């Protein structure tokens, strides 16, 4: 009553037709979620600090 009659169980993508490409050969990965947890990138260009003669520290 479980499991069996249909096909598509861990089928997600209906249809194959790899005759053309041919480079990723691993078995269900994709993930076409569109996220980022690196924000020290925008963080390491200084946003223009490092280079510029700028002081701050006044006594």
Same mark, same amino acid.
């Given at each position: 009553?479980?499991?069996?009659? !249909?096909?598509?169980?861990?089928? !997600?993508?209906?249809?194959?037709? &790899? ?5 990723? +050969? &691993? ?13 020290? &990138? ?5 946003? !223009?600090? +490092? ?5 701050? !520290?006044?006594?």
């Amino acid at each position: 009553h479980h499991g069996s009659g !249909t096909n598509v169980d861990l089928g !997600t993508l209906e249809g194959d037709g &790899m005759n053309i490409e041919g480079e990723e +050969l &691993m078995p269900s990965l994709q993930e076409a979620l569109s996220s980022d947890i690196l924000n020290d &990138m925008e963080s390491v260009l200084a946003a !223009t600090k +490092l280079d510029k003669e700028s002081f701050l !520290t006044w006594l």
